[PDB]
Amino acid sequence: PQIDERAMEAGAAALQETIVDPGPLDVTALAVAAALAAGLHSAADDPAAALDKCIVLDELTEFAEKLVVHDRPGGIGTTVEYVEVYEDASGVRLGTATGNAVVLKMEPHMWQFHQSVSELADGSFEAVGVIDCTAMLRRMTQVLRVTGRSGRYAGKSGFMTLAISDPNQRPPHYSVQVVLC
Amino acid sequence: PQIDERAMEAGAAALQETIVDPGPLDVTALAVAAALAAGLHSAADDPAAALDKCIVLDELTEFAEKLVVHDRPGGIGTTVEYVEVYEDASGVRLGTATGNAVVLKMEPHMWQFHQSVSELADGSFEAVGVIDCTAMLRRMTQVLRVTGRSGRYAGKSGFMTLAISDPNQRPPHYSVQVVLC
Ligand SMILES: CC[C@@H]1C[C@]2(C)C=C(C)[C@H](C)C[C@]23NC(=O)C(=C3O)C(=O)[C@]2(C)[C@@H](CC[C@H]3[C@H]2CCC[C@@H]3O)C[C@H]1O
Ligand SMILES: CC[C@@H]1C[C@]2(C)C=C(C)[C@H](C)C[C@]23NC(=O)C(=C3O)C(=O)[C@]2(C)[C@@H](CC[C@H]3[C@H]2CCC[C@@H]3O)C[C@H]1O
């Protein structure tokens, strides 16, 4: 399968940015968010307690295995179809996510609506979000809504973080975290 | 209803930033996202079609009328309680929102979990999001998930945008859009 050059070279694009402004969110923080949103946490509870109530997928990497862009003039409504693979820190494949995106806006920041279904050994979950692709190029983290569907994830919901993690790779790798409750 | 000095002076804080990087969304884009998320629209239709399917609140201004901070040592888990006013472009009051936030992370970017309920003339809706406050000071737009509660908004869902709009005010003014379907 093929990967559009814009995805292959996205890491290189990041390296040309003059704004290099990381702002990660750790999984404990993401678990507090997930538990608060699920009404299963109180902000006089302790963060490690939120983490204990959650299903946690961290120290995950993802990158594109297939990415096709269907361009429209001016870029508005351009569509993307992708399959990405999840790997652990050691490079072991854990699963895939199959999704599509729609370009909402190009300038000054490119924004995309993303929706995907992730399939791992122990179940599946959906991710949906409105993400600032220019902010990601400038190293920022973006957050998507996660809804569990099958297996271990069923009936649970939470959040996912996405950020570029190694811009020297082609295609680049992204750091991914998922917390559900 | 008093307003914590950090909220009063946040516009001045924004003006001290050296990264000034706005990236807004137009409502049509936001309507495309809302309609895609709700399964009422197809990537292959045209954007103005999505706009007609939606309830649209564009060009809103908001600012705090009350804001109380309950600080926690280290900044993480600090809570915020606020009441804000909505105005249209000409300055007519449309309603209010009362919200609660929790600081998730302080550095290198401050992140907050927000949840709020907006009360307008034709009903109420809830907004929930995980937002990068540092990105906001640097002029970026943040997106929250919206769920209608009552009236016209009931049974509808979509998105809200938030960005600083006049940092010269005390407290500063924000631009808001809400689109539901
Ligand atoms: C920063 C946001 C993007 C990261 C994603 C979300 C991360 C991951 C893990 C998956 C694989 C998708 C992502 N990877 C991509 O390469 C693209 C993605 O949406 C695109 O849409 C590109 C290929 C990328 C760049 C430019 C293209 C855009 C297609 C539409 C026209 C643009 O000129 C945008 C990416 O950097
Ligand atoms: C997303 C950026 C924030 C804008 C909000 C979301 C916008 C609006 C319209 C409503 C009214 C709330 C907001 N306004 C604020 O002043 C605060 C808010 O969360 C705070 O939390 C402050 C008072 C602000 C600054 C510093 C404080 C923080 C409280 C916690 C300790 C921080 O040191 C952060 C704001 O820039």
CB contact under 8 A, B138 and A21: yes
Q: How far apart are alpha carbons A92 and B95 in whole angstroms?
A: 52
CB contact under 8 A, B21 and A138: yes
Question: Nearest residue of B to residue A31 by CA position?
Answer: B104
CA distances, B130 to each of A110, A143, B53, B98, B173 (Å) = 20, 7, 27, 17, 20
Q: Which amino acid type is present at position A125?
A: F
Phi, psi of A40 (to 5 degrees): -110, 15
Question: Which atom of ligand 1 is found nearest the CA of A84?
Answer: 11
Q: What is the resolution of this structure in A?
A: 1.9
Say how far residue A114 (Cα) sits from the centre of its chain: 9
Say yes or no: CB of residue B72 within 6 Å of ligand 2: no
Q: How many residues does chain B have?
A: 181
Say how far residue A31 (Cα) sits from the centre of its chain: 16
- Chain B segment 23-42 residues within 8 A of A by beta carbon are 23-26, 29-30, 32-33, 36-37
DSSP A110: -
Q: How far apart are alpha carbons B146 and B124 in whole angstroms?
A: 10
Joined tokens for residue B95: 């309603």
Joined tokens for residue B172: 């500063």
Nearest Cβ partner for A22 among B23, B76, B108: B108
CB contact under 8 A, A25 and B105: yes
From chain B, pick out residues whose CB is under 8 angstroms from the CB of A132.
23, 140-141
CB contact under 8 A, B140 and A132: yes
Residue showing tokens 């290099």: A20
Bridge partners (DSSP) of residue A162 are: A142, A176
Domain boundaries, chain B: 20-181
> Ligand 1 pocket test: which of A8, A67, A83, A175 has the largest number of ligand atoms within 8 Å of its C-beta?
A67
Q: How far apart are alpha carbons A114 and A131 in whole angstroms?
A: 7
Say yes or no: CB of residue B103 within 6 Å of ligand 2: yes
Q: How far apart are alpha carbons B109 and B125 in whole angstroms?
A: 28
| A81 contact partners, CB below 8 Å, separation of at least 6 | A66, A67, A68, A70, A99, A100
Q: What is the 3-state secondary structure (H, E, C) of B79-98?
A: EEEEEEEEECCCCCEEEEEE
Give which of B32, B103, B92 is closest to B60, Cα–Cα: B92
Partner B contacted by A132 (CB < 8 A): yes
Q: Which amino acid type is present at position B28?
A: T
Say yes or no: CB of residue B58 within 6 Å of ligand 2: no
Element housing B52 (H / E): helix B47-53
Joined tokens for residue B145: 């998930």
Q: Which amino acid type is present at position B158?
A: G
Q: How was this structure determined?
A: X-ray
Q: How far apart are alpha carbons A6 and B9 in whole angstroms?
A: 41
From chain A, pick out residues whose CB is under 8 angstroms from the CB of B21.
19, 108-109, 138
Ligand 2 centre distance from Cα of residue B17 (Å)? 16
